[PDB]
């Protein structure tokens, strides 16, 4: 089942391939929610862009791995109060990226 996930005031429909946080629905690209998506399956665990990458893009795209960078940059502008210091998307430096439990 997935009819949507709630992450502090950030909500996540799947169904709809919608997101909304405090209520005001955000416009993604469908890779932007793919991306978002899976984090939100995995809430609060750390993965490498090399994973996001074959799981997100597929096993078939050997593109660069900072495309996944570029993406999270994009979700955190489009997200994020202040993406100087997320608060749902977090840095794991060195390591990769990993969606944040709010406690």
């Known amino acids: 089942s997935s009819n949507e996930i709630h992450i502090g005031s950030l909500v996540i429909f799947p169904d709809a391939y919608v997101v909304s946080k405090r ?4 416009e993604l690209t469908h890779r932007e929610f793919e991306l978002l998506h899976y984090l939100a399956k995995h809430i609060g665990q750390v993965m490498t862009r090399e994973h996001l990458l074959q799981t997100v893009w597929g096993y078939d795209y050997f593109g660069d791995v900072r495309t996944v960078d570029v993406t999270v940059r994009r979700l955190r502008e489009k997200i994020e109060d202040n993406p100087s210091h997320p608060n749902w998307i977090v840095t ?5 990226y990993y969606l944040r439990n709010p406690e």
């Open 92 to 96: 794991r430096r060195g390591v990769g």
């Open 23 to 26: 209520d005001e629905t955000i």
